[PDB]
């Protein structure tokens, strides 16, 4: 399976600050036939299942705020939250749906200082 | 990682018929401390990313119709669609979020005869 490695494991920050998290895939998820990145980000709030946040590396899922921005390509991706809000506190996972079994990184937990 | 094995690989059916698909995990996803099954089902329509359908083995995600029913426990789960509708045609994946890396089965493609 393709291995997804994220960093940092956990990120502490205060409300309103910018947050950036990285993700690297053991092999490229950029398909040479259509130039699309089969890379998604899922948001997992405490005690909840992972919910789709972003896909195609940079496309936002219905209902996701503009403050969330996915970028990167090939094997290196990044999720950026320009100004972290209270409702954004959760563990974020990058995942590849390039080839089965689709796989997840081990996540980055975003907390608010304390 | 926990291995998720689904069956059948593909299921053909006509509009309105009942559809049942199975999923087995290589190890139990029933947590003995709270008796919850960290098992979810994701729906992947053609050309789209996997979207949350059911979690906690039987709880429906916001917006999911009553015709979808998740059941099972431990290592054996089942997704049942009482009367398949046109919009339900897609590949369904079971996934465990019991322990990282969260993993997906290789899916079951539901098609409408032809
Ligand atoms: Zn592997
Ligand atoms: Zn394994």
JSON list of C-alpha atoms and ligand atoms in Angstrom, two decimals:
[
{"chain": "A", "resi": 1, "resn": "UNK", "atom": "CA", "xyz": [0.00, 0.00, 0.00]},
{"chain": "A", "resi": 2, "resn": "UNK", "atom": "CA", "xyz": [1.02, 3.62, -0.45]},
{"chain": "A", "resi": 3, "resn": "UNK", "atom": "CA", "xyz": [2.29, 5.05, 2.83]},
{"chain": "A", "resi": 4, "resn": "UNK", "atom": "CA", "xyz": [1.15, 8.51, 3.90]},
{"chain": "A", "resi": 5, "resn": "UNK", "atom": "CA", "xyz": [3.41, 10.32, 6.36]},
{"chain": "A", "resi": 6, "resn": "UNK", "atom": "CA", "xyz": [2.28, 13.55, 8.00]},
{"chain": "A", "resi": 7, "resn": "UNK", "atom": "CA", "xyz": [4.10, 16.15, 10.09]},
{"chain": "A", "resi": 8, "resn": "UNK", "atom": "CA", "xyz": [4.01, 17.45, 12.69]},
{"chain": "A", "resi": 9, "resn": "UNK", "atom": "CA", "xyz": [2.18, 14.82, 14.75]},
{"chain": "A", "resi": 10, "resn": "UNK", "atom": "CA", "xyz": [0.51, 17.57, 16.77]},
{"chain": "A", "resi": 11, "resn": "UNK", "atom": "CA", "xyz": [0.39, 21.34, 16.38]},
{"chain": "A", "resi": 12, "resn": "UNK", "atom": "CA", "xyz": [-0.53, 23.77, 19.14]},
{"chain": "A", "resi": 13, "resn": "UNK", "atom": "CA", "xyz": [-1.86, 27.22, 18.31]},
{"chain": "A", "resi": 14, "resn": "UNK", "atom": "CA", "xyz": [-4.13, 30.04, 19.48]},
{"chain": "A", "resi": 15, "resn": "UNK", "atom": "CA", "xyz": [-7.44, 31.07, 17.95]},
{"chain": "A", "resi": 16, "resn": "UNK", "atom": "CA", "xyz": [-6.99, 33.10, 14.77]},
{"chain": "A", "resi": 17, "resn": "UNK", "atom": "CA", "xyz": [-3.45, 32.00, 13.95]},
{"chain": "A", "resi": 18, "resn": "UNK", "atom": "CA", "xyz": [-2.26, 30.45, 10.69]},
{"chain": "A", "resi": 19, "resn": "UNK", "atom": "CA", "xyz": [-1.73, 26.68, 10.73]},
{"chain": "A", "resi": 20, "resn": "UNK", "atom": "CA", "xyz": [0.18, 24.60, 8.20]},
{"chain": "A", "resi": 21, "resn": "UNK", "atom": "CA", "xyz": [0.48, 20.81, 8.11]},
{"chain": "A", "resi": 22, "resn": "UNK", "atom": "CA", "xyz": [2.40, 18.58, 5.71]},
{"chain": "A", "resi": 23, "resn": "UNK", "atom": "CA", "xyz": [1.86, 15.19, 4.11]},
{"chain": "A", "resi": 24, "resn": "UNK", "atom": "CA", "xyz": [4.11, 13.05, 1.91]},
{"chain": "A", "resi": 25, "resn": "UNK", "atom": "CA", "xyz": [3.20, 9.89, 0.00]},
{"chain": "A", "resi": 26, "resn": "UNK", "atom": "CA", "xyz": [5.68, 7.03, -0.44]},
{"chain": "A", "resi": 27, "resn": "UNK", "atom": "CA", "xyz": [4.92, 7.09, -4.16]},
{"chain": "A", "resi": 28, "resn": "UNK", "atom": "CA", "xyz": [3.37, 9.73, -6.42]},
{"chain": "A", "resi": 29, "resn": "UNK", "atom": "CA", "xyz": [-0.40, 10.08, -6.48]},
{"chain": "A", "resi": 30, "resn": "UNK", "atom": "CA", "xyz": [-0.27, 12.33, -9.54]},
{"chain": "A", "resi": 31, "resn": "UNK", "atom": "CA", "xyz": [-1.71, 10.28, -12.39]},
{"chain": "A", "resi": 32, "resn": "UNK", "atom": "CA", "xyz": [0.27, 10.88, -15.58]},
{"chain": "A", "resi": 33, "resn": "UNK", "atom": "CA", "xyz": [-2.77, 10.12, -17.78]},
{"chain": "A", "resi": 34, "resn": "UNK", "atom": "CA", "xyz": [-4.93, 13.01, -16.55]},
{"chain": "A", "resi": 35, "resn": "UNK", "atom": "CA", "xyz": [-2.52, 15.05, -14.39]},
{"chain": "A", "resi": 36, "resn": "UNK", "atom": "CA", "xyz": [-4.79, 14.79, -11.35]},
{"chain": "A", "resi": 37, "resn": "UNK", "atom": "CA", "xyz": [-3.65, 14.30, -7.75]},
{"chain": "A", "resi": 38, "resn": "UNK", "atom": "CA", "xyz": [-5.72, 11.59, -6.04]},
{"chain": "A", "resi": 39, "resn": "UNK", "atom": "CA", "xyz": [-5.04, 13.18, -2.68]},
{"chain": "A", "resi": 40, "resn": "UNK", "atom": "CA", "xyz": [-7.65, 14.12, -0.09]},
{"chain": "A", "resi": 41, "resn": "UNK", "atom": "CA", "xyz": [-7.77, 15.59, 3.39]},
{"chain": "A", "resi": 42, "resn": "UNK", "atom": "CA", "xyz": [-10.25, 14.39, 5.99]},
{"chain": "A", "resi": 43, "resn": "UNK", "atom": "CA", "xyz": [-11.17, 16.21, 9.19]},
{"chain": "A", "resi": 44, "resn": "UNK", "atom": "CA", "xyz": [-11.74, 14.16, 12.34]},
{"chain": "A", "resi": 45, "resn": "UNK", "atom": "CA", "xyz": [-13.24, 16.05, 15.25]},
{"chain": "A", "resi": 46, "resn": "UNK", "atom": "CA", "xyz": [-12.88, 14.44, 18.70]},
{"chain": "A", "resi": 47, "resn": "UNK", "atom": "CA", "xyz": [-15.02, 11.32, 18.97]},
{"chain": "A", "resi": 48, "resn": "UNK", "atom": "CA", "xyz": [-16.15, 11.49, 15.34]},
{"chain": "A", "resi": 49, "resn": "UNK", "atom": "CA", "xyz": [-15.31, 9.60, 12.11]},
{"chain": "A", "resi": 50, "resn": "UNK", "atom": "CA", "xyz": [-13.07, 11.16, 9.41]},
{"chain": "A", "resi": 51, "resn": "UNK", "atom": "CA", "xyz": [-15.11, 13.51, 7.17]},
{"chain": "A", "resi": 52, "resn": "UNK", "atom": "CA", "xyz": [-14.05, 14.72, 3.71]},
{"chain": "A", "resi": 53, "resn": "UNK", "atom": "CA", "xyz": [-12.50, 18.18, 3.76]},
{"chain": "A", "resi": 54, "resn": "UNK", "atom": "CA", "xyz": [-10.54, 18.53, 0.52]},
{"chain": "A", "resi": 55, "resn": "UNK", "atom": "CA", "xyz": [-9.87, 16.34, -2.54]},
{"chain": "A", "resi": 56, "resn": "UNK", "atom": "CA", "xyz": [-7.99, 16.54, -5.86]},
{"chain": "A", "resi": 57, "resn": "UNK", "atom": "CA", "xyz": [-5.38, 18.06, -3.52]},
{"chain": "A", "resi": 58, "resn": "UNK", "atom": "CA", "xyz": [-6.97, 21.53, -3.61]},
{"chain": "A", "resi": 59, "resn": "UNK", "atom": "CA", "xyz": [-10.73, 21.26, -4.17]},
{"chain": "A", "resi": 60, "resn": "UNK", "atom": "CA", "xyz": [-12.87, 22.07, -1.14]},
{"chain": "A", "resi": 61, "resn": "UNK", "atom": "CA", "xyz": [-15.76, 19.77, -0.23]},
{"chain": "A", "resi": 62, "resn": "UNK", "atom": "CA", "xyz": [-19.26, 21.23, 0.04]},
{"chain": "A", "resi": 63, "resn": "UNK", "atom": "CA", "xyz": [-19.55, 23.41, 3.13]},
{"chain": "A", "resi": 64, "resn": "UNK", "atom": "CA", "xyz": [-15.82, 23.83, 3.79]},
{"chain": "A", "resi": 65, "resn": "UNK", "atom": "CA", "xyz": [-14.75, 27.48, 4.52]},
{"chain": "A", "resi": 66, "resn": "UNK", "atom": "CA", "xyz": [-12.33, 29.39, 2.28]},
{"chain": "A", "resi": 67, "resn": "UNK", "atom": "CA", "xyz": [-9.83, 29.54, 5.13]},
{"chain": "A", "resi": 68, "resn": "UNK", "atom": "CA", "xyz": [-8.90, 25.93, 4.33]},
{"chain": "A", "resi": 69, "resn": "UNK", "atom": "CA", "xyz": [-6.47, 25.60, 1.45]},
{"chain": "A", "resi": 70, "resn": "UNK", "atom": "CA", "xyz": [-4.94, 22.43, 0.09]},
{"chain": "A", "resi": 71, "resn": "UNK", "atom": "CA", "xyz": [-1.82, 22.61, -2.07]},
{"chain": "A", "resi": 72, "resn": "UNK", "atom": "CA", "xyz": [1.04, 20.51, -3.36]},
{"chain": "A", "resi": 73, "resn": "UNK", "atom": "CA", "xyz": [1.41, 17.82, -6.00]},
{"chain": "A", "resi": 74, "resn": "UNK", "atom": "CA", "xyz": [3.03, 14.47, -6.72]},
{"chain": "A", "resi": 75, "resn": "UNK", "atom": "CA", "xyz": [4.27, 13.22, -3.35]},
{"chain": "A", "resi": 76, "resn": "UNK", "atom": "CA", "xyz": [4.29, 16.45, -1.33]},
{"chain": "A", "resi": 77, "resn": "UNK", "atom": "CA", "xyz": [1.10, 18.09, -0.06]},
{"chain": "A", "resi": 78, "resn": "UNK", "atom": "CA", "xyz": [0.13, 20.78, 2.43]},
{"chain": "A", "resi": 79, "resn": "UNK", "atom": "CA", "xyz": [-3.06, 21.87, 4.19]},
{"chain": "A", "resi": 80, "resn": "UNK", "atom": "CA", "xyz": [-3.16, 25.50, 5.29]},
{"chain": "A", "resi": 81, "resn": "UNK", "atom": "CA", "xyz": [-5.71, 27.14, 7.56]},
{"chain": "A", "resi": 82, "resn": "UNK", "atom": "CA", "xyz": [-5.17, 30.90, 7.25]},
{"chain": "A", "resi": 83, "resn": "UNK", "atom": "CA", "xyz": [-6.91, 31.75, 10.52]},
{"chain": "A", "resi": 84, "resn": "UNK", "atom": "CA", "xyz": [-7.78, 28.81, 12.78]},
{"chain": "A", "resi": 85, "resn": "UNK", "atom": "CA", "xyz": [-11.29, 28.94, 14.26]},
{"chain": "A", "resi": 86, "resn": "UNK", "atom": "CA", "xyz": [-12.74, 27.13, 17.28]},
{"chain": "A", "resi": 87, "resn": "UNK", "atom": "CA", "xyz": [-14.65, 24.67, 15.09]},
{"chain": "A", "resi": 88, "resn": "UNK", "atom": "CA", "xyz": [-11.44, 23.70, 13.27]},
{"chain": "A", "resi": 89, "resn": "UNK", "atom": "CA", "xyz": [-9.89, 21.98, 16.29]},
{"chain": "A", "resi": 90, "resn": "UNK", "atom": "CA", "xyz": [-9.49, 18.35, 15.27]},
{"chain": "A", "resi": 91, "resn": "UNK", "atom": "CA", "xyz": [-7.11, 15.76, 13.87]},
{"chain": "A", "resi": 92, "resn": "UNK", "atom": "CA", "xyz": [-6.47, 16.18, 10.15]},
{"chain": "A", "resi": 93, "resn": "UNK", "atom": "CA", "xyz": [-5.59, 13.24, 7.91]},
{"chain": "A", "resi": 94, "resn": "UNK", "atom": "CA", "xyz": [-4.32, 13.18, 4.35]},
{"chain": "A", "resi": 95, "resn": "UNK", "atom": "CA", "xyz": [-5.32, 10.14, 2.34]},
{"chain": "A", "resi": 96, "resn": "UNK", "atom": "CA", "xyz": [-4.68, 8.76, -1.09]},
{"chain": "A", "resi": 97, "resn": "UNK", "atom": "CA", "xyz": [-7.39, 7.30, -3.29]},
{"chain": "A", "resi": 98, "resn": "UNK", "atom": "CA", "xyz": [-5.00, 6.75, -6.19]},
{"chain": "A", "resi": 99, "resn": "UNK", "atom": "CA", "xyz": [-4.89, 2.97, -5.75]},
{"chain": "A", "resi": 100, "resn": "UNK", "atom": "CA", "xyz": [-6.64, 0.49, -3.47]},
{"chain": "A", "resi": 101, "resn": "UNK", "atom": "CA", "xyz": [-6.45, -0.04, -0.62]},
{"chain": "A", "resi": 102, "resn": "UNK", "atom": "CA", "xyz": [-6.96, 3.69, -0.13]},
{"chain": "A", "resi": 103, "resn": "UNK", "atom": "CA", "xyz": [-4.72, 4.73, 2.75]},
{"chain": "A", "resi": 104, "resn": "UNK", "atom": "CA", "xyz": [-4.50, 7.37, 5.48]},
{"chain": "A", "resi": 105, "resn": "UNK", "atom": "CA", "xyz": [-1.58, 9.08, 7.17]},
{"chain": "A", "resi": 106, "resn": "UNK", "atom": "CA", "xyz": [-1.50, 8.91, 10.96]},
{"chain": "A", "resi": 107, "resn": "UNK", "atom": "CA", "xyz": [-2.79, 12.46, 11.26]},
{"chain": "A", "resi": 108, "resn": "UNK", "atom": "CA", "xyz": [-1.88, 15.83, 12.76]},
{"chain": "A", "resi": 109, "resn": "UNK", "atom": "CA", "xyz": [-3.78, 16.95, 15.82]},
{"chain": "A", "resi": 110, "resn": "UNK", "atom": "CA", "xyz": [-4.54, 20.67, 15.93]},
{"chain": "A", "resi": 111, "resn": "UNK", "atom": "CA", "xyz": [-5.14, 22.01, 19.42]},
{"chain": "A", "resi": 112, "resn": "UNK", "atom": "CA", "xyz": [-5.58, 25.48, 20.89]},
{"chain": "A", "resi": 113, "resn": "UNK", "atom": "CA", "xyz": [-2.81, 26.34, 23.38]},
{"chain": "A", "resi": 114, "resn": "UNK", "atom": "CA", "xyz": [-3.42, 24.85, 26.85]},
{"chain": "B", "resi": 1, "resn": "UNK", "atom": "CA", "xyz": [-2.44, -2.37, 9.57]},
{"chain": "B", "resi": 2, "resn": "UNK", "atom": "CA", "xyz": [-5.89, -3.89, 9.92]},
{"chain": "B", "resi": 3, "resn": "UNK", "atom": "CA", "xyz": [-6.96, -5.49, 6.65]},
{"chain": "B", "resi": 4, "resn": "UNK", "atom": "CA", "xyz": [-10.50, -4.92, 5.38]},
{"chain": "B", "resi": 5, "resn": "UNK", "atom": "CA", "xyz": [-11.84, -7.52, 2.95]},
{"chain": "B", "resi": 6, "resn": "UNK", "atom": "CA", "xyz": [-15.12, -6.94, 1.13]},
{"chain": "B", "resi": 7, "resn": "UNK", "atom": "CA", "xyz": [-17.32, -9.21, -0.97]},
{"chain": "B", "resi": 8, "resn": "UNK", "atom": "CA", "xyz": [-18.50, -9.42, -3.63]},
{"chain": "B", "resi": 9, "resn": "UNK", "atom": "CA", "xyz": [-16.06, -7.31, -5.66]},
{"chain": "B", "resi": 10, "resn": "UNK", "atom": "CA", "xyz": [-18.93, -6.15, -7.87]},
{"chain": "B", "resi": 11, "resn": "UNK", "atom": "CA", "xyz": [-22.69, -6.57, -7.64]},
{"chain": "B", "resi": 12, "resn": "UNK", "atom": "CA", "xyz": [-25.10, -6.13, -10.55]},
{"chain": "B", "resi": 13, "resn": "UNK", "atom": "CA", "xyz": [-28.74, -5.28, -9.93]},
{"chain": "B", "resi": 14, "resn": "UNK", "atom": "CA", "xyz": [-31.80, -3.51, -11.32]},
{"chain": "B", "resi": 15, "resn": "UNK", "atom": "CA", "xyz": [-33.37, -0.33, -9.99]},
{"chain": "B", "resi": 16, "resn": "UNK", "atom": "CA", "xyz": [-35.46, -0.93, -6.88]},
{"chain": "B", "resi": 17, "resn": "UNK", "atom": "CA", "xyz": [-33.90, -4.24, -5.84]},
{"chain": "B", "resi": 18, "resn": "UNK", "atom": "CA", "xyz": [-32.35, -5.05, -2.47]},
{"chain": "B", "resi": 19, "resn": "UNK", "atom": "CA", "xyz": [-28.55, -5.02, -2.33]},
{"chain": "B", "resi": 20, "resn": "UNK", "atom": "CA", "xyz": [-26.33, -6.50, 0.37]},
{"chain": "B", "resi": 21, "resn": "UNK", "atom": "CA", "xyz": [-22.55, -6.24, 0.64]},
{"chain": "B", "resi": 22, "resn": "UNK", "atom": "CA", "xyz": [-20.18, -7.70, 3.21]},
{"chain": "B", "resi": 23, "resn": "UNK", "atom": "CA", "xyz": [-16.99, -6.61, 4.93]},
{"chain": "B", "resi": 24, "resn": "UNK", "atom": "CA", "xyz": [-14.65, -8.43, 7.32]},
{"chain": "B", "resi": 25, "resn": "UNK", "atom": "CA", "xyz": [-11.76, -6.99, 9.31]},
{"chain": "B", "resi": 26, "resn": "UNK", "atom": "CA", "xyz": [-8.58, -9.00, 9.99]},
{"chain": "B", "resi": 27, "resn": "UNK", "atom": "CA", "xyz": [-8.93, -8.09, 13.66]},
{"chain": "B", "resi": 28, "resn": "UNK", "atom": "CA", "xyz": [-11.87, -6.86, 15.73]},
{"chain": "B", "resi": 29, "resn": "UNK", "atom": "CA", "xyz": [-12.77, -3.18, 15.60]},
{"chain": "B", "resi": 30, "resn": "UNK", "atom": "CA", "xyz": [-15.13, -3.52, 18.57]},
{"chain": "B", "resi": 31, "resn": "UNK", "atom": "CA", "xyz": [-13.44, -1.67, 21.42]},
{"chain": "B", "resi": 32, "resn": "UNK", "atom": "CA", "xyz": [-13.90, -3.58, 24.68]},
{"chain": "B", "resi": 33, "resn": "UNK", "atom": "CA", "xyz": [-13.70, -0.39, 26.76]},
{"chain": "B", "resi": 34, "resn": "UNK", "atom": "CA", "xyz": [-16.80, 1.28, 25.31]},
{"chain": "B", "resi": 35, "resn": "UNK", "atom": "CA", "xyz": [-18.37, -1.49, 23.19]},
{"chain": "B", "resi": 36, "resn": "UNK", "atom": "CA", "xyz": [-18.30, 0.66, 20.05]},
{"chain": "B", "resi": 37, "resn": "UNK", "atom": "CA", "xyz": [-17.47, -0.54, 16.54]},
{"chain": "B", "resi": 38, "resn": "UNK", "atom": "CA", "xyz": [-15.01, 1.83, 14.84]},
{"chain": "B", "resi": 39, "resn": "UNK", "atom": "CA", "xyz": [-16.33, 0.79, 11.45]},
{"chain": "B", "resi": 40, "resn": "UNK", "atom": "CA", "xyz": [-17.51, 3.12, 8.71]},
{"chain": "B", "resi": 41, "resn": "UNK", "atom": "CA", "xyz": [-18.82, 2.88, 5.16]},
{"chain": "B", "resi": 42, "resn": "UNK", "atom": "CA", "xyz": [-17.86, 5.40, 2.50]},
{"chain": "B", "resi": 43, "resn": "UNK", "atom": "CA", "xyz": [-19.64, 5.91, -0.82]},
{"chain": "B", "resi": 44, "resn": "UNK", "atom": "CA", "xyz": [-17.54, 6.65, -3.90]},
{"chain": "B", "resi": 45, "resn": "UNK", "atom": "CA", "xyz": [-19.50, 7.73, -6.95]},
{"chain": "B", "resi": 46, "resn": "UNK", "atom": "CA", "xyz": [-17.69, 7.47, -10.31]},
{"chain": "B", "resi": 47, "resn": "UNK", "atom": "CA", "xyz": [-14.90, 10.03, -10.55]},
{"chain": "B", "resi": 48, "resn": "UNK", "atom": "CA", "xyz": [-15.40, 11.28, -6.99]},
{"chain": "B", "resi": 49, "resn": "UNK", "atom": "CA", "xyz": [-13.57, 10.86, -3.65]},
{"chain": "B", "resi": 50, "resn": "UNK", "atom": "CA", "xyz": [-14.92, 8.52, -0.92]},
{"chain": "B", "resi": 51, "resn": "UNK", "atom": "CA", "xyz": [-17.64, 10.28, 1.12]},
{"chain": "B", "resi": 52, "resn": "UNK", "atom": "CA", "xyz": [-18.85, 9.21, 4.58]},
{"chain": "B", "resi": 53, "resn": "UNK", "atom": "CA", "xyz": [-22.04, 7.16, 4.46]},
{"chain": "B", "resi": 54, "resn": "UNK", "atom": "CA", "xyz": [-22.26, 5.31, 7.78]},
{"chain": "B", "resi": 55, "resn": "UNK", "atom": "CA", "xyz": [-20.14, 5.09, 10.95]},
{"chain": "B", "resi": 56, "resn": "UNK", "atom": "CA", "xyz": [-20.23, 3.34, 14.34]},
{"chain": "B", "resi": 57, "resn": "UNK", "atom": "CA", "xyz": [-21.24, 0.44, 12.07]},
{"chain": "B", "resi": 58, "resn": "UNK", "atom": "CA", "xyz": [-24.90, 1.50, 11.94]},
{"chain": "B", "resi": 59, "resn": "UNK", "atom": "CA", "xyz": [-25.21, 5.28, 12.34]},
{"chain": "B", "resi": 60, "resn": "UNK", "atom": "CA", "xyz": [-26.17, 7.15, 9.18]},
{"chain": "B", "resi": 61, "resn": "UNK", "atom": "CA", "xyz": [-24.27, 10.31, 8.23]},
{"chain": "B", "resi": 62, "resn": "UNK", "atom": "CA", "xyz": [-26.21, 13.55, 7.72]},
{"chain": "B", "resi": 63, "resn": "UNK", "atom": "CA", "xyz": [-28.27, 13.38, 4.54]},
{"chain": "B", "resi": 64, "resn": "UNK", "atom": "CA", "xyz": [-28.10, 9.61, 4.03]},
{"chain": "B", "resi": 65, "resn": "UNK", "atom": "CA", "xyz": [-31.52, 7.98, 3.21]},
{"chain": "B", "resi": 66, "resn": "UNK", "atom": "CA", "xyz": [-33.16, 5.40, 5.48]},
{"chain": "B", "resi": 67, "resn": "UNK", "atom": "CA", "xyz": [-32.81, 2.80, 2.75]},
{"chain": "B", "resi": 68, "resn": "UNK", "atom": "CA", "xyz": [-29.15, 2.44, 3.75]},
{"chain": "B", "resi": 69, "resn": "UNK", "atom": "CA", "xyz": [-28.61, 0.21, 6.75]},
{"chain": "B", "resi": 70, "resn": "UNK", "atom": "CA", "xyz": [-25.32, -0.78, 8.31]},
{"chain": "B", "resi": 71, "resn": "UNK", "atom": "CA", "xyz": [-25.15, -3.80, 10.61]},
{"chain": "B", "resi": 72, "resn": "UNK", "atom": "CA", "xyz": [-22.72, -6.27, 12.13]},
{"chain": "B", "resi": 73, "resn": "UNK", "atom": "CA", "xyz": [-20.14, -6.13, 14.88]},
{"chain": "B", "resi": 74, "resn": "UNK", "atom": "CA", "xyz": [-16.63, -7.22, 15.82]},
{"chain": "B", "resi": 75, "resn": "UNK", "atom": "CA", "xyz": [-15.05, -8.39, 12.57]},
{"chain": "B", "resi": 76, "resn": "UNK", "atom": "CA", "xyz": [-18.14, -8.97, 10.41]},
{"chain": "B", "resi": 77, "resn": "UNK", "atom": "CA", "xyz": [-20.16, -6.11, 8.93]},
{"chain": "B", "resi": 78, "resn": "UNK", "atom": "CA", "xyz": [-22.84, -5.65, 6.29]},
{"chain": "B", "resi": 79, "resn": "UNK", "atom": "CA", "xyz": [-24.30, -2.74, 4.33]},
{"chain": "B", "resi": 80, "resn": "UNK", "atom": "CA", "xyz": [-27.85, -3.21, 3.08]},
{"chain": "B", "resi": 81, "resn": "UNK", "atom": "CA", "xyz": [-29.72, -1.03, 0.62]},
{"chain": "B", "resi": 82, "resn": "UNK", "atom": "CA", "xyz": [-33.38, -2.10, 0.81]},
{"chain": "B", "resi": 83, "resn": "UNK", "atom": "CA", "xyz": [-34.32, -0.64, -2.58]},
{"chain": "B", "resi": 84, "resn": "UNK", "atom": "CA", "xyz": [-31.43, 0.56, -4.75]},
{"chain": "B", "resi": 85, "resn": "UNK", "atom": "CA", "xyz": [-32.00, 3.94, -6.40]},
{"chain": "B", "resi": 86, "resn": "UNK", "atom": "CA", "xyz": [-30.27, 5.52, -9.41]},
{"chain": "B", "resi": 87, "resn": "UNK", "atom": "CA", "xyz": [-28.23, 7.86, -7.22]},
{"chain": "B", "resi": 88, "resn": "UNK", "atom": "CA", "xyz": [-26.88, 4.91, -5.21]},
{"chain": "B", "resi": 89, "resn": "UNK", "atom": "CA", "xyz": [-24.82, 3.50, -8.08]},
{"chain": "B", "resi": 90, "resn": "UNK", "atom": "CA", "xyz": [-21.22, 3.68, -6.88]},
{"chain": "B", "resi": 91, "resn": "UNK", "atom": "CA", "xyz": [-18.38, 1.77, -5.27]},
{"chain": "B", "resi": 92, "resn": "UNK", "atom": "CA", "xyz": [-18.88, 1.23, -1.54]},
{"chain": "B", "resi": 93, "resn": "UNK", "atom": "CA", "xyz": [-15.96, 0.88, 0.85]},
{"chain": "B", "resi": 94, "resn": "UNK", "atom": "CA", "xyz": [-15.89, -0.21, 4.47]},
{"chain": "B", "resi": 95, "resn": "UNK", "atom": "CA", "xyz": [-13.12, 1.31, 6.55]},
{"chain": "B", "resi": 96, "resn": "UNK", "atom": "CA", "xyz": [-11.83, 1.02, 10.07]},
{"chain": "B", "resi": 97, "resn": "UNK", "atom": "CA", "xyz": [-10.89, 4.00, 12.20]},
{"chain": "B", "resi": 98, "resn": "UNK", "atom": "CA", "xyz": [-10.13, 1.84, 15.22]},
{"chain": "B", "resi": 99, "resn": "UNK", "atom": "CA", "xyz": [-6.36, 2.26, 14.95]},
{"chain": "B", "resi": 100, "resn": "UNK", "atom": "CA", "xyz": [-4.06, 4.26, 12.69]},
{"chain": "B", "resi": 101, "resn": "UNK", "atom": "CA", "xyz": [-3.36, 4.04, 9.88]},
{"chain": "B", "resi": 102, "resn": "UNK", "atom": "CA", "xyz": [-7.10, 3.98, 9.21]},
{"chain": "B", "resi": 103, "resn": "UNK", "atom": "CA", "xyz": [-7.67, 1.48, 6.40]},
{"chain": "B", "resi": 104, "resn": "UNK", "atom": "CA", "xyz": [-10.12, 0.77, 3.58]},
{"chain": "B", "resi": 105, "resn": "UNK", "atom": "CA", "xyz": [-11.30, -2.44, 1.96]},
{"chain": "B", "resi": 106, "resn": "UNK", "atom": "CA", "xyz": [-10.93, -2.65, -1.81]},
{"chain": "B", "resi": 107, "resn": "UNK", "atom": "CA", "xyz": [-14.62, -1.91, -2.32]},
{"chain": "B", "resi": 108, "resn": "UNK", "atom": "CA", "xyz": [-17.74, -3.36, -3.91]},
{"chain": "B", "resi": 109, "resn": "UNK", "atom": "CA", "xyz": [-18.99, -1.77, -7.11]},
{"chain": "B", "resi": 110, "resn": "UNK", "atom": "CA", "xyz": [-22.77, -1.58, -7.40]},
{"chain": "B", "resi": 111, "resn": "UNK", "atom": "CA", "xyz": [-24.01, -1.32, -10.98]},
{"chain": "B", "resi": 112, "resn": "UNK", "atom": "CA", "xyz": [-27.44, -1.46, -12.61]},
{"chain": "B", "resi": 113, "resn": "UNK", "atom": "CA", "xyz": [-27.76, -4.43, -14.99]},
{"chain": "B", "resi": 114, "resn": "UNK", "atom": "CA", "xyz": [-26.21, -3.76, -18.42]},
{"chain": "C", "resi": 1, "resn": "LIG", "atom": "ZN1", "xyz": [2.45, -0.70, 1.38]},
{"chain": "C", "resi": 2, "resn": "LIG", "atom": "ZN1", "xyz": [-1.33, -4.74, 8.34]}
]
